[PDB]
């Protein structure tokens, strides 16, 4: 990773990745941490945005599991963790498209 011009947030590791791409389910999971971590399981924030529809769920896990979603749409997922002071920044907008409906399939 280049600092260069902007965009170099030094993301502490959390860099949503599509686990599985489903019709009505979709699946993310984000690490990138180091071990030997003292107490105090920490927590991270997740916050889904729709083009009508947005809604956030607080993930106490870096994996979540999104389902009752509809087929061919784009889902914006971005997940932060949390701190006692001075919380990490919201992810950038991933974007992230759900299975397609029932359809042909190429031979």
Known sequence: GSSGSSGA???????????????????????????????????????????????????????VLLTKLQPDTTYIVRVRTLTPLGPGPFSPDHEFRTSPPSGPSSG
């Open 9 to 63: 947030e030094s993301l502490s590791g959390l860099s949503l990745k599509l686990v599985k791409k489903e019709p009505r389910q979709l699946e993310l999971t984000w690490a990138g941490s180091r071990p030997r971590n003292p107490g105090g399981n920490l927590s991270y924030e997740l916050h889904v945005l729709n083009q009508d529809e947005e809604w956030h769920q607080m993930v106490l896990e870096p994996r």
